């Protein structure tokens, strides 16, 4: 809203107003790599063949 101060005498200017503001989302992304060698996956999995 646009705020109001009242004035005396004859009424020169206003009718009460609104403002509809719209703003555009800017999208981004974040990356983080992570590696595991085959020497460790055989420990995380379980039994062998």
């Amino acid at each position: 809203h646009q705020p109001l101060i009242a004035r005396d005498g004859p009424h020169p200017i206003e009718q009460p107003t609104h403002n509809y503001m719209t703003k555009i989302i800017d999208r981004r992304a974040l990356n983080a790599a992570f590696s595991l060698a085959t020497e460790a996956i055989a420990l995380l999995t379980g039994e062998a063949l």
């Binding site: 004035r7 005396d8 005498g9 004859p10 009424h11 020169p12 200017i13 009718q15």
Partner: protein
């Protein structure tokens, strides 16, 4: 209410895009030419589409002559379904105060009568075009009256040239120029007739006495700094005094009972003093700022109460 105000309803159609719908809401205090005093009209009537003559879209001088055949109205609130205006010839509002908006590059002051002028200036030809409806809205420019008598004089005197520069104005030391374009021969001849009629009708038998004062003005211009600042550097009566020595006829027919100068001045006021209303339209409107500021800047609103 019926007497004090008169609200028209310029209807807005169904199919309007929002790039077009958000342009009308910036057109809050404008000047709109209704052809009638109907209470329900459409945008195809207001716009420049209805302004065209038979096939010929007229230039800035013929744009004058179809203003004064119409009714100036001021937008008071833009609703989504309609535009509400108030024609100035009927009445303003109950309170009698309608806010306008400067489109001029020129400030306003208190008590200046407003006449409206076409978008004549350069950097000023701003036509709100609605693409979904193919509508342009050529909004006129509210100017002070001593500008509006210059510009009409600059446009009418320019067409008298081309029947056989000028376009540079100055107001309060700010340079501004108006656009130059070839003029349609039709409306120019409608302006020349309104000159010469109101010009020849201001000539009376008593004016041959006033013409004998031309050597009195010129001999006075060497003493008074008011008359030297009056005549002009490029006037005619300065060159009429250096070459022609006029003198009056001695007697008048029935010269006892009639007043020769009194009939000459009244005929001058009703025909040549009236001339500024016969070329342009009437200054209905003047500015009465109440408490804000005595000078209204460009792009700002200004309260308005009617003038005779």
């Amino acid at each position: 209410m019926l007497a004090d105000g008169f609200e028209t309803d310029i209807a807005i159609p169904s199919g309007i895009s929002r790039p077009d719908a958000a342009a009308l809401q910036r057109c809050e205090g404008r000047v709109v030419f209704l052809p009638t005093i109907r209470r329900q009209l459409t945008l195809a009537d207001v716009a420049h589409e209805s302004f065209v003559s038979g096939g010929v879209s007229p230039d800035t001088l013929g744009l004058l002559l179809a203003y004064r055949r119409r009714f100036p109205a001021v937008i008071t609130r833009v609703l989504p379904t309609r535009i509400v205006a108030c024609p100035l010839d009927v009445g303003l509002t109950h309170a009698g105060t309608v806010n306008l908006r400067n489109t001029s590059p020129v400030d306003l002051c208190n008590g200046d009568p407003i006449s409206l002028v076409p978008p004549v200036f350069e950097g000023q030809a701003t036509d709100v075009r609605l693409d979904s409806l193919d509508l342009t809205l050529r909004f006129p420019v509210p100017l002070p009256s001593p500008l509006a008598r210059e510009i009409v004089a600059r446009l009418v005197a320019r067409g008298i040239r081309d029947l056989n520069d000028l376009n540079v104005l100055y107001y309060n030391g700010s340079r501004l120029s108006l656009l130059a374009d070839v003029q349609q021969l039709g409306p120019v001849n409608a302006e020349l007739r309104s000159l010469v009629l109101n010009m020849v009708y201001s000539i009376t038998e008593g004016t041959t006495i006033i013409l004998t004062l031309i050597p009195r003005l010129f001999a006075l211009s060497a003493q008074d700094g008011y008359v030297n600042a009056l005549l002009q550097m490029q006037s005619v009566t300065r060159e009429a005094a250096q070459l022609i020595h006029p003198e009056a006829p001695a007697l008048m027919q029935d010269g006892e009972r009639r007043l020769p100068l009194y009939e000459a001045l009244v005929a001058w006021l009703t025909h040549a003093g009236q001339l500024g209303d016969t070329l342009a339209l009437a200054p209905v409107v003047r500015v009465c700022t109440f408490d804000g500021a005595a000078v209204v800047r460009s792009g700002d609103m200004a309260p308005v109460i009617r003038y005779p």
